[PDB]
Design a binder for this molecule. Sequence first.
Ligand code: MG
Length: 58
Amino acid sequence: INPVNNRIQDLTERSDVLRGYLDYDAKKERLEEVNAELEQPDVWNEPERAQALGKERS
RNA sequence: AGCCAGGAUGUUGGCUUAGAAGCAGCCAUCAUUUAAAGAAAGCGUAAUAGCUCACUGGUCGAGUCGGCCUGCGCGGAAGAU
Ligand SMILES: [Mg+2]
């Protein structure tokens, strides 16, 4: 049981560290603002901005 | 032929895609509601949407369709006294 217990904890550390490297906080806000621009009804009035957020949001 | 109705459902078949809804493709392509309606033939939408069509009903009432052999013609076909 304990080998797996440590397995989960190791993954905990790795996943939190990867959230650190990729800075999940700013991605969360940036994607949420991406979704803000996405909800913005004119989002597809400008195709360039729309597809920008398409690729960006993806 | 026109003309008038319908042109459905699961279901946007899924996946890759950013989106992909019949209609970018990949990719299956069935079953159901049936008069009949394609997991779509074209147009179209960023995507949907939307629009026709195939299919089918109803009014009209004699032809209509598109290949084969063959005769004669048409376009392709601009030059310098
Ligand atoms: Mg000739």
